[PDB]
Tab-separated table of C-alpha atoms and ligand atoms in Angstrom:
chain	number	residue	atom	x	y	z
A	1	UNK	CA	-13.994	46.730	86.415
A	2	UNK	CA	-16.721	47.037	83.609
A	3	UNK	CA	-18.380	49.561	85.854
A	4	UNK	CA	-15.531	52.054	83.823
A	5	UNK	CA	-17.735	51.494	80.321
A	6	UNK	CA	-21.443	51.837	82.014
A	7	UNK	CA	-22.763	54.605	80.130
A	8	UNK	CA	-19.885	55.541	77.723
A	9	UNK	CA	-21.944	56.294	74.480
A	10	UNK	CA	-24.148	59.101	73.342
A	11	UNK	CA	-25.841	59.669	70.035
A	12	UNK	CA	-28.252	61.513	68.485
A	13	UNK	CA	-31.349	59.560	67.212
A	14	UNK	CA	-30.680	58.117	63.696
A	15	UNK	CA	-27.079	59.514	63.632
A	16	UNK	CA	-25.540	56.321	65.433
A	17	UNK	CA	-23.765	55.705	68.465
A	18	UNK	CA	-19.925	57.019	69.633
A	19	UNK	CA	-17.510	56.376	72.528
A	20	UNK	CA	-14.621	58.739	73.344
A	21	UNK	CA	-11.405	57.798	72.609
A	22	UNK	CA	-7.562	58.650	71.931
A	23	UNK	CA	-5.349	58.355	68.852
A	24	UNK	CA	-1.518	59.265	68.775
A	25	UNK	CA	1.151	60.953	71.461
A	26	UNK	CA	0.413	63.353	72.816
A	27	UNK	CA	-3.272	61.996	73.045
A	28	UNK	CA	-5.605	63.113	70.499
A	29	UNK	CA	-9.400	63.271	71.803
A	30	UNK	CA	-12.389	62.180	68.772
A	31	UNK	CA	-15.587	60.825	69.422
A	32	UNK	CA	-15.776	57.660	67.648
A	33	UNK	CA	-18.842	56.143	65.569
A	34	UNK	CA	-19.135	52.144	66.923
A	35	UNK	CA	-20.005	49.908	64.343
A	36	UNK	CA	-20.638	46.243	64.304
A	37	UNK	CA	-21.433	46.384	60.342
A	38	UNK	CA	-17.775	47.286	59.027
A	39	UNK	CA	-14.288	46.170	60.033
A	40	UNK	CA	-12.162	50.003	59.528
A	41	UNK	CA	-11.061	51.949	62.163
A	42	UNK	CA	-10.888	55.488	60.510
A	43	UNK	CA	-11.202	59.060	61.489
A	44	UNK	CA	-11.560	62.179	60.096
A	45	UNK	CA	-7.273	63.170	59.729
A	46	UNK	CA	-8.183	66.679	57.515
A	47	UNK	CA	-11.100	69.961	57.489
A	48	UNK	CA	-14.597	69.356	57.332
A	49	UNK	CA	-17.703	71.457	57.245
A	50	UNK	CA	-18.743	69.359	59.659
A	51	UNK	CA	-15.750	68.331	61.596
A	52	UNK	CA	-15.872	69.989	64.892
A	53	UNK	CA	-12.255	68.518	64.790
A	54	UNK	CA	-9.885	65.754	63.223
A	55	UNK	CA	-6.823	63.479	63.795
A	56	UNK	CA	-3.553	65.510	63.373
A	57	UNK	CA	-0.700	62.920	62.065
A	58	UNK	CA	2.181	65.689	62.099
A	59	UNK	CA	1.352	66.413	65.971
A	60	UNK	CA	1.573	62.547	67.199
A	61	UNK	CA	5.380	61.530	67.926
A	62	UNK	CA	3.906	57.302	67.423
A	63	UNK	CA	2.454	57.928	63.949
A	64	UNK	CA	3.352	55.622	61.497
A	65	UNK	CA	3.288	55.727	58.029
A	66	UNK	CA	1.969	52.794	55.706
A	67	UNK	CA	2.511	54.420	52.811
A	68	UNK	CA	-0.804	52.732	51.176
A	69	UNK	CA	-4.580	54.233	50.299
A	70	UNK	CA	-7.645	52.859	51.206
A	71	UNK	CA	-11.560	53.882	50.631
A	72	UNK	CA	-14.751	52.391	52.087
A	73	UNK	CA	-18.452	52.333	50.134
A	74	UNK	CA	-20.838	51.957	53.056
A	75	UNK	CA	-24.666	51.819	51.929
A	76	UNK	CA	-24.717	55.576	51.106
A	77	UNK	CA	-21.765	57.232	51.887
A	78	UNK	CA	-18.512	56.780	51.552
A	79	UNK	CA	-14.873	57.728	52.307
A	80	UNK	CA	-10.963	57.746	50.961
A	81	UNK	CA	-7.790	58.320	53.056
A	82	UNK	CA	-3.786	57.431	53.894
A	83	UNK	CA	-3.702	54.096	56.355
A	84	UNK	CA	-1.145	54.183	58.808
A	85	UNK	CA	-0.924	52.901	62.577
A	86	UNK	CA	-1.120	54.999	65.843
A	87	UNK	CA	-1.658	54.380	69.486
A	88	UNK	CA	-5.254	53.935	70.860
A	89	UNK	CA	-6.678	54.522	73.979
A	90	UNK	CA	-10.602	54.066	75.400
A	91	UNK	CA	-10.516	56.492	78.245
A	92	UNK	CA	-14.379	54.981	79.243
A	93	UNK	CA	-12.976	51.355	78.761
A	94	UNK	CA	-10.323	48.781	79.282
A	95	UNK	CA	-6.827	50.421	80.584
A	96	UNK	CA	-4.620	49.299	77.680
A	97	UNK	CA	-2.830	51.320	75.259
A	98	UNK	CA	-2.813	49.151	71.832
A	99	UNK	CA	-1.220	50.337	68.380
A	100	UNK	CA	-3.702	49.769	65.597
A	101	UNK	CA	-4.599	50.469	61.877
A	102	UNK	CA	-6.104	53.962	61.205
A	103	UNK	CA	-7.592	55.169	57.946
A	104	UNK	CA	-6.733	59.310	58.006
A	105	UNK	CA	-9.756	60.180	56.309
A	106	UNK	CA	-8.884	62.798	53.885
A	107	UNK	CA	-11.785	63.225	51.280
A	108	UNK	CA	-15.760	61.867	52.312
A	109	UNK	CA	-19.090	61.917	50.210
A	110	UNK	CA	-22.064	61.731	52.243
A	111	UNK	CA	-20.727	60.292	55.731
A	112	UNK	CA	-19.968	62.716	58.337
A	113	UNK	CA	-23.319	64.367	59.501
A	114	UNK	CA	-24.090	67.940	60.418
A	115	UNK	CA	-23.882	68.443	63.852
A	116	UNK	CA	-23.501	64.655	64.520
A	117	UNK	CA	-20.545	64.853	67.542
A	118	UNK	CA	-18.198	62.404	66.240
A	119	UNK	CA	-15.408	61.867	63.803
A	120	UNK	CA	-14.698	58.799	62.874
A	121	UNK	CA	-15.552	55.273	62.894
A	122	UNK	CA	-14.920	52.104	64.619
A	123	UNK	CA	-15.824	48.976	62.316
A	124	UNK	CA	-15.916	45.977	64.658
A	125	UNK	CA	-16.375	43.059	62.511
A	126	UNK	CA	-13.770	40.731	60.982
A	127	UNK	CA	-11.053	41.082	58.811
A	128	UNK	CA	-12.939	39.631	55.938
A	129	UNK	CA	-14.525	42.637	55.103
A	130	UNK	CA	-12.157	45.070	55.973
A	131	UNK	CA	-10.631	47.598	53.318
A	132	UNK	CA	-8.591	47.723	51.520
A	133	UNK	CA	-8.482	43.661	51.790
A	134	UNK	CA	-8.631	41.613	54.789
A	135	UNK	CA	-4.948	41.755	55.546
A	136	UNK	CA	-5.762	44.897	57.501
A	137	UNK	CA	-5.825	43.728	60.745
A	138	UNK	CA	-9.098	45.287	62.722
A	139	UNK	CA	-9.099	47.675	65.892
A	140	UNK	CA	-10.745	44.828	68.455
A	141	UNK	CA	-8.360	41.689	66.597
A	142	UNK	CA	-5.389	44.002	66.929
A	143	UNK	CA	-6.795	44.918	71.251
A	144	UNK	CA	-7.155	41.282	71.868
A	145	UNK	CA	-3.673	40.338	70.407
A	146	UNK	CA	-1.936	42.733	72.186
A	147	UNK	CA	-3.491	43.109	75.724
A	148	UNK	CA	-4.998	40.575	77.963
A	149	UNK	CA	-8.622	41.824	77.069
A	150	UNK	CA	-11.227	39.087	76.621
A	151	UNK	CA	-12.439	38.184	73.028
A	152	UNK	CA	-15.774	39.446	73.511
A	153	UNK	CA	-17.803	42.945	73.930
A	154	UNK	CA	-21.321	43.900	74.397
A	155	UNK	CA	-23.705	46.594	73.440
A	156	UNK	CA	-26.573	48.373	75.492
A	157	UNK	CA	-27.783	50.749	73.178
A	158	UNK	CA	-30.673	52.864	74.568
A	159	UNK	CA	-33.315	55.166	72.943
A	160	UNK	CA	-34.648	58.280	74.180
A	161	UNK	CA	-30.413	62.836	73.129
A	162	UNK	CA	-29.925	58.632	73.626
A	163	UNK	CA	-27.102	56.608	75.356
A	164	UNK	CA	-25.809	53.582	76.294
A	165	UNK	CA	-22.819	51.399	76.889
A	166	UNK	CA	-20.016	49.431	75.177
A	167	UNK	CA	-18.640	46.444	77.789
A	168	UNK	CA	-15.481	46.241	76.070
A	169	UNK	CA	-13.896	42.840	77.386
A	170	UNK	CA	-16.897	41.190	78.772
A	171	UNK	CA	-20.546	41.569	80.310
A	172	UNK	CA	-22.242	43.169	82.726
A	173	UNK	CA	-24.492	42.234	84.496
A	174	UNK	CA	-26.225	45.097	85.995
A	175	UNK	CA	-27.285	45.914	81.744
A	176	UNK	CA	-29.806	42.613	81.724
A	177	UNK	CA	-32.718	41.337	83.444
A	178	UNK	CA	-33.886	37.603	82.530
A	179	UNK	CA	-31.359	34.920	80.308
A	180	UNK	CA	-29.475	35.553	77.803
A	181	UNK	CA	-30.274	33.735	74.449
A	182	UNK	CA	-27.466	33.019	72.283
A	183	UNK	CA	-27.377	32.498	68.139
A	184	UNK	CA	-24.206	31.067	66.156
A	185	UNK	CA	-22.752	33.582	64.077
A	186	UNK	CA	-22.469	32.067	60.958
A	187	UNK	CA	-19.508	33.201	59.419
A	188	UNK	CA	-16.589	35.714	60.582
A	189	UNK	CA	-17.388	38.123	58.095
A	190	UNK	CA	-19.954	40.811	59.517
A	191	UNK	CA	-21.984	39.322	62.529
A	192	UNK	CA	-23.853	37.296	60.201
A	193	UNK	CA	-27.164	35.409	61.987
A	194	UNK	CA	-29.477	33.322	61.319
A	195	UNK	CA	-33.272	33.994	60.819
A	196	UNK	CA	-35.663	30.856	60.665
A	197	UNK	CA	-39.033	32.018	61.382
A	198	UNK	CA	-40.835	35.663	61.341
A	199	UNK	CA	-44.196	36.509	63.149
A	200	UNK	CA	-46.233	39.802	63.410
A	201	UNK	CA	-48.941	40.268	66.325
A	202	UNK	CA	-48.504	36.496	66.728
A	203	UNK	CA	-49.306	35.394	62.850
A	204	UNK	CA	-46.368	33.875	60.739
A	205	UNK	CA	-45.574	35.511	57.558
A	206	UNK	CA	-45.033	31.903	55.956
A	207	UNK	CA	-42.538	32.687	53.558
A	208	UNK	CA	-39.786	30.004	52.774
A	209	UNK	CA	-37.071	30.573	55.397
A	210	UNK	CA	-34.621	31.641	52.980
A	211	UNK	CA	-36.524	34.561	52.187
A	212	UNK	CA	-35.044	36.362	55.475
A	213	UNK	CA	-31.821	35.498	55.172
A	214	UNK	CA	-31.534	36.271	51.668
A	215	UNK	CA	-28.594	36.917	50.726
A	216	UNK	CA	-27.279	37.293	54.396
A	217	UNK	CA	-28.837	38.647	57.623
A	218	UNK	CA	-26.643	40.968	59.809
A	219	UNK	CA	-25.923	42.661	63.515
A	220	UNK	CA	-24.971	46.267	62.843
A	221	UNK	CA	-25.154	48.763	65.210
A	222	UNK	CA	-24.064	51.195	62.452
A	223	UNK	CA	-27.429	51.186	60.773
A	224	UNK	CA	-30.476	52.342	61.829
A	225	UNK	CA	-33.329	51.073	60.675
A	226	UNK	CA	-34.527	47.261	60.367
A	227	UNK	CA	-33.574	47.003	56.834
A	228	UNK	CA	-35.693	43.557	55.174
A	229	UNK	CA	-35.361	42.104	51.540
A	230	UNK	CA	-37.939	42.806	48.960
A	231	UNK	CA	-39.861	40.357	49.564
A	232	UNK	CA	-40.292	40.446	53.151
A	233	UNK	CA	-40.494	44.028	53.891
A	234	UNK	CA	-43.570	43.910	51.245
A	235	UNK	CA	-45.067	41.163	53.337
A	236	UNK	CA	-44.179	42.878	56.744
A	237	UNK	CA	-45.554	46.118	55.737
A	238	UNK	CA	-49.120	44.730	54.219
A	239	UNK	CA	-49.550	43.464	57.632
A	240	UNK	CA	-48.311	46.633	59.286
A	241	UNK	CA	-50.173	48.639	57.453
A	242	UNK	CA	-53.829	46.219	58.003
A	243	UNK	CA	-53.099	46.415	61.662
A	244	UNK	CA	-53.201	49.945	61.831
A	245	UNK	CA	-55.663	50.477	59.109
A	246	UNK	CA	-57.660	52.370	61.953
A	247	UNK	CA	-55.313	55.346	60.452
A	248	UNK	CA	-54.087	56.495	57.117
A	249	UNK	CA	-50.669	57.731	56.604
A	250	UNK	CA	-48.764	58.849	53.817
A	251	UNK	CA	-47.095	56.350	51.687
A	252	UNK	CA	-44.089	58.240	51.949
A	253	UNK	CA	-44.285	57.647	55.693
A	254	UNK	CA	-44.285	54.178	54.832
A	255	UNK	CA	-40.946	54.620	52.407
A	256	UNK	CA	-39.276	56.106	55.818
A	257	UNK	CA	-39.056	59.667	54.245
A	258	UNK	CA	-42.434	61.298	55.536
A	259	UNK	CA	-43.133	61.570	59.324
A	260	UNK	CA	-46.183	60.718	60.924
A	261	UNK	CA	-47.169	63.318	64.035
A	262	UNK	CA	-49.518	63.102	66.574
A	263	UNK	CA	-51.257	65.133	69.774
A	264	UNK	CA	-48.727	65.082	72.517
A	265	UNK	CA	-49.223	61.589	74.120
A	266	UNK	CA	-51.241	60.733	72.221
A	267	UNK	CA	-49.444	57.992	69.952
A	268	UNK	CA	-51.421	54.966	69.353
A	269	UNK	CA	-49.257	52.392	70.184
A	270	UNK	CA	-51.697	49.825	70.407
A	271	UNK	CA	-52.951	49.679	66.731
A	272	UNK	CA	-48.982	49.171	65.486
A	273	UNK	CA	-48.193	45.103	66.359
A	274	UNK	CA	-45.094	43.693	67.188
A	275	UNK	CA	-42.625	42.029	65.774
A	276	UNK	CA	-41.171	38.673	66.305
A	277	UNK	CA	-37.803	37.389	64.661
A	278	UNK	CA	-36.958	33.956	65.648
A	279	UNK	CA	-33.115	33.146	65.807
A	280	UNK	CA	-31.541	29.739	65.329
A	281	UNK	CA	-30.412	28.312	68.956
A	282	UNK	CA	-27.106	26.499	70.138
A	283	UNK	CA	-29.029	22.978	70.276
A	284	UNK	CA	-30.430	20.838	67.402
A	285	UNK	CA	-33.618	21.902	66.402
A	286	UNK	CA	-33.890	24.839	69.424
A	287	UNK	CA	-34.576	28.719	68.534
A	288	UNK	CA	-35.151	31.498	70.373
A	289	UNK	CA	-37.590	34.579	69.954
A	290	UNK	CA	-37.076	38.371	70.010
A	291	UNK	CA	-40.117	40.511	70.451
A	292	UNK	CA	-39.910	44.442	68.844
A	293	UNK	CA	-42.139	47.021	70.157
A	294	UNK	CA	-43.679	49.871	67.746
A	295	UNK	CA	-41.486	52.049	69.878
A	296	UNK	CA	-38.280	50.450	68.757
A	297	UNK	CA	-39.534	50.675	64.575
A	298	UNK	CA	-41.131	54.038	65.124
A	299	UNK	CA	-38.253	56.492	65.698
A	300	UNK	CA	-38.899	59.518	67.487
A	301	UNK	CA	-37.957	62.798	65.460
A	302	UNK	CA	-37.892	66.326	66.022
A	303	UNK	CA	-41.062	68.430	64.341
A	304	UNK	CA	-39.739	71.377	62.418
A	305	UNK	CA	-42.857	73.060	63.168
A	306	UNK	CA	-44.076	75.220	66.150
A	307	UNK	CA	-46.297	71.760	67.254
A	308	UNK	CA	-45.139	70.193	69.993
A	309	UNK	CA	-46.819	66.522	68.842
A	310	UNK	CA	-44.789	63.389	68.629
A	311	UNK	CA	-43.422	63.107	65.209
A	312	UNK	CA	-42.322	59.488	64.154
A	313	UNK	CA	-40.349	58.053	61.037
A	314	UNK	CA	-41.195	54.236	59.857
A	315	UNK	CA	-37.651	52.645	61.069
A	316	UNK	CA	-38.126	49.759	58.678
A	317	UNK	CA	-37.053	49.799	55.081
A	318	UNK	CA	-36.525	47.868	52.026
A	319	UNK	CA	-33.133	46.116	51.763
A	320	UNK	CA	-31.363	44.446	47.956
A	321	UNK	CA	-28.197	42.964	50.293
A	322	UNK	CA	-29.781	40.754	52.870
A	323	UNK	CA	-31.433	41.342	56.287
A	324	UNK	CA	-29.728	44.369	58.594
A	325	UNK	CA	-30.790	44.050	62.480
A	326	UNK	CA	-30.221	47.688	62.812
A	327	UNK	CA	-29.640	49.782	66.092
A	328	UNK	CA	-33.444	50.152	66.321
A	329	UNK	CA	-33.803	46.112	66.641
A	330	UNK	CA	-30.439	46.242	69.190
A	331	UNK	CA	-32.376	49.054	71.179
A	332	UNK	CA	-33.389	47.593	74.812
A	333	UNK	CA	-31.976	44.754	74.547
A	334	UNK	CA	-28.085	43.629	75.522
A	335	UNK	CA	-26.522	42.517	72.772
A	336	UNK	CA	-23.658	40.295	73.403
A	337	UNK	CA	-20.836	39.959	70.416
A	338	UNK	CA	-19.057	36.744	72.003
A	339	UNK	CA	-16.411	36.168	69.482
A	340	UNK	CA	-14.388	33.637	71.773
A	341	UNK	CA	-17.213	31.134	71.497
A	342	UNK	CA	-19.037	32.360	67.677
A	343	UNK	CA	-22.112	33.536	68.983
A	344	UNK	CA	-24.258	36.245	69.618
A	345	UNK	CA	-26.295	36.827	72.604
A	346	UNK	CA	-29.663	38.591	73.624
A	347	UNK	CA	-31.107	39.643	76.367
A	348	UNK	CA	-33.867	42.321	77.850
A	349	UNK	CA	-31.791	45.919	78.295
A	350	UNK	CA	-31.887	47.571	81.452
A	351	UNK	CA	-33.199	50.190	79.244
A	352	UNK	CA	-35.752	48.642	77.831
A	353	UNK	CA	-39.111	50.079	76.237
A	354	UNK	CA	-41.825	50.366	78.414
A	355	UNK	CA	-45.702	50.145	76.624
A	356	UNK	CA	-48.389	49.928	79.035
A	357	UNK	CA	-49.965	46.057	77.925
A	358	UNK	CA	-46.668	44.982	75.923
A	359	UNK	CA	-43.218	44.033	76.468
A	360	UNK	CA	-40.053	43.389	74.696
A	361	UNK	CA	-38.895	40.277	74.641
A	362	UNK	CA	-36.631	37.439	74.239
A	363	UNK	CA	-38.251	33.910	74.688
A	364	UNK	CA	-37.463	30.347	74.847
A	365	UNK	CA	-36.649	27.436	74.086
A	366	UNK	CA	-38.500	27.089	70.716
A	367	UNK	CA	-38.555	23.815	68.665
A	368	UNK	CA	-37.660	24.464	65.283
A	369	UNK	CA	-36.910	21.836	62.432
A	370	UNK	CA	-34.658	22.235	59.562
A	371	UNK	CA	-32.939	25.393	60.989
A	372	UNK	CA	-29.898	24.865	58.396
A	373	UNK	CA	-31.590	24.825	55.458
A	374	UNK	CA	-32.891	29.237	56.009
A	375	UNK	CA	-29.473	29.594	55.424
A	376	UNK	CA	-28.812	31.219	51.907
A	377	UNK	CA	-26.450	29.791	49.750
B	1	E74	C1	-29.246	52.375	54.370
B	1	E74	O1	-29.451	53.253	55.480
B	1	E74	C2	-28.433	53.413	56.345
B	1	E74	C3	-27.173	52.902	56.041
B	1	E74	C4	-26.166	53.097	56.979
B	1	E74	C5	-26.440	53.812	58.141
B	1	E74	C6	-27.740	54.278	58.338
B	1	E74	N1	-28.726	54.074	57.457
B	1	E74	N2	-28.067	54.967	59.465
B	1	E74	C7	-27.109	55.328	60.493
B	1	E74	C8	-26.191	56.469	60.072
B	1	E74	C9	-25.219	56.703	61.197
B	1	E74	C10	-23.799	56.975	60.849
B	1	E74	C11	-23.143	56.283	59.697
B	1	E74	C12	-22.804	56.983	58.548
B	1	E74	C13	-22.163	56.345	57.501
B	1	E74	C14	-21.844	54.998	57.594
B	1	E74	C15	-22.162	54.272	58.730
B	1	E74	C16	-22.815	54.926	59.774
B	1	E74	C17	-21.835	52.779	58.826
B	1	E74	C18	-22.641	51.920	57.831
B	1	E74	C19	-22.482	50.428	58.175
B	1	E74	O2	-21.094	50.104	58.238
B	1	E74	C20	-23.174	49.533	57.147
B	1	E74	N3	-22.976	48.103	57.480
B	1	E74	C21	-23.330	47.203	56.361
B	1	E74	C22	-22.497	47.458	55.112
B	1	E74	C23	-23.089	47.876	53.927
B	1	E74	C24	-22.315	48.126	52.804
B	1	E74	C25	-20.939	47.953	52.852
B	1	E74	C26	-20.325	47.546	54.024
B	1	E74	C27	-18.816	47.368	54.087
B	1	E74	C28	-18.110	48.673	54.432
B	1	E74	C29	-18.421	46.283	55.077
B	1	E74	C30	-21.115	47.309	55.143
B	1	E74	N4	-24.049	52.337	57.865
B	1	E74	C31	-24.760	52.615	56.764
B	1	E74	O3	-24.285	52.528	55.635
């Protein structure tokens, strides 16, 4: 039945990924931001600039009251609202009604988007870092307790405005070509992974291990970018930058605010190398590869200007809270978030990105020694 949830998300580029769903009686439609680096469900519950509409507690007879506050500091922005508990429906998913935690969002700094298409969020991690303490019991732990729904999803995300799906309950296997490759997730906190060895156009960066898991390294399809600690995004973008020395860009493209353009078609792919994260494996001393294409960390973006060239932002940025495998790094592949057994899976999308000489990735068995200690402690 996971033919339902083939193709139930849409996005714009850079503005995340949503699925449709239902809160309260009679059903309330909002499109609904899916996030695999939080643990809140919350939704926009009062006006907005940019609300095209909101969650309306008076006109839902199954609204409950907690009677508590709550607010969540993302990277950036940030929200405040009322929790209380509501019934929830995923019209594009699994036929179960549940009743679940809701944050009504009632005041926001910097976290709905103009003209974005959805209203709320969906945090999908564990309870450990759920606001406003882990005693809120998350939207998927609350579905899996109360329904006969597997304790597992998966995410095709897809780039170019961009879609994809959300296998709520399972995976598909008409989203994946090849094997999928599994990692442990480390701890039940956010998706935490991880990364023991880093390569760009084939050449290690030889830093210590640690270096890219420092202080954690993360699934979250609620960023965008690949976000990399000091350290390693300097070391990443010296080689970047040499590879394509053939051009110049602005150093602000290289900060991710500037945008590099280009003749329609025109893009030269082949002077930007790829990028290879190795993953620790389910056996001792076995890891697995993931290959990124410049057309995954070179996001496509809309010229304000009468040209029609391909306009790109750098997709990779400097991180001070540990590695982030953003949607950009999730793009074509199938990203499997199997809770049940603690680990996460990868595997070539259906959608994949297609270069002419190159190809995304995801390669093994590697041999790999002393996977524990890249860890950071
Ligand atoms: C830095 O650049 C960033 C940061 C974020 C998003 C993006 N770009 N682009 C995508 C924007 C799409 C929509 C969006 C807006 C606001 C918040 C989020 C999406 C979720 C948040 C994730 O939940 C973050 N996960 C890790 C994290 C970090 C801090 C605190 C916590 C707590 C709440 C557990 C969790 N995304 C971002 O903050």
């Amino acid at each position: 039945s996971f033919v339902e949830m083939v193709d139930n998300l849409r996005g714009k580029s850079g503005q995340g990924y949503y699925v449709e769903m239902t809160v309260g009686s009679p059903p309330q439609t909002l499109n609904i931001l899916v996030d695999t680096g939080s643990s809140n469900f919350a939704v926009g519950a009062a006006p907005h600039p940019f609300l095209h509409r909101y969650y309306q507690r008076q006109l839902s007879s199954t609204y409950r009251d907690l009677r508590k506050g709550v607010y969540v500091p993302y990277t950036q922005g940030k929200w405040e609202g009322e929790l209380g508990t509501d019934l929830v429906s995923i019209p594009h998913g699994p036929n179960v009604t549940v009743r679940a935690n809701i944050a009504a969002i009632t005041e926001s700094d910097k976290f709905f988007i103009n003209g974005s298409n959805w209203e709320g969020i969906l945090g999908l991690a564990y309870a450990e870092i759920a606001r406003p303490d882990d005693s809120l019991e998350p939207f998927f732990d609350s579905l899996v307790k109360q329904t006969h729904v597997p304790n597992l999803f998966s995410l095709q995300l897809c780039g170019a405005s961009v879609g994809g799906s959300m296998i709520i309950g399972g995976i598909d296997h008409s989203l994946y070509t090849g094997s999928l490759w599994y990692t442990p997730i480390r701890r039940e906190w956010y998706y935490e992974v991880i990364i023991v060895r880093v390569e760009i156009n084939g050449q290690d960066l030889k830093m210590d291990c640690k270096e890219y898991n420092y202080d954690k390294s993360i699934v979250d399809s609620g960023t965008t970018n690949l976000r990399l600690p000091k350290k390693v995004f300097e070391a990443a973008v010296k080689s970047i930058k040499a590879a394509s020395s053939t051009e110049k860009f602005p150093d602000g493209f290289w900060l991710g605010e500037q945008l590099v353009c280009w003749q329609a078609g025109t893009t030269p792919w082949n002077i930007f190398p790829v990028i290879s994260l190795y993953l620790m494996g389910e056996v001792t001393n076995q890891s697995f590869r993931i290959t990124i294409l410049p057309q995954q960390y070179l996001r496509p973006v809309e010229d304000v200007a009468t040209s029609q060239d391909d306009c790109y932002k750098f997709a990779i940025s400097q991180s001070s809270t540990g590695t982030v495998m953003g949607a950009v790094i999730m793009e074509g592949f199938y990203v499997v978030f199997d809770r049940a057994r603690k680990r996460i899976g990868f595997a070539v999308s259906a959608c994949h990105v297609h270069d002419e000489f190159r190809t995304a990735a995801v390669e093994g068995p590697f041999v790999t020694l002393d996977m524990e200690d890249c860890g950071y402690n």
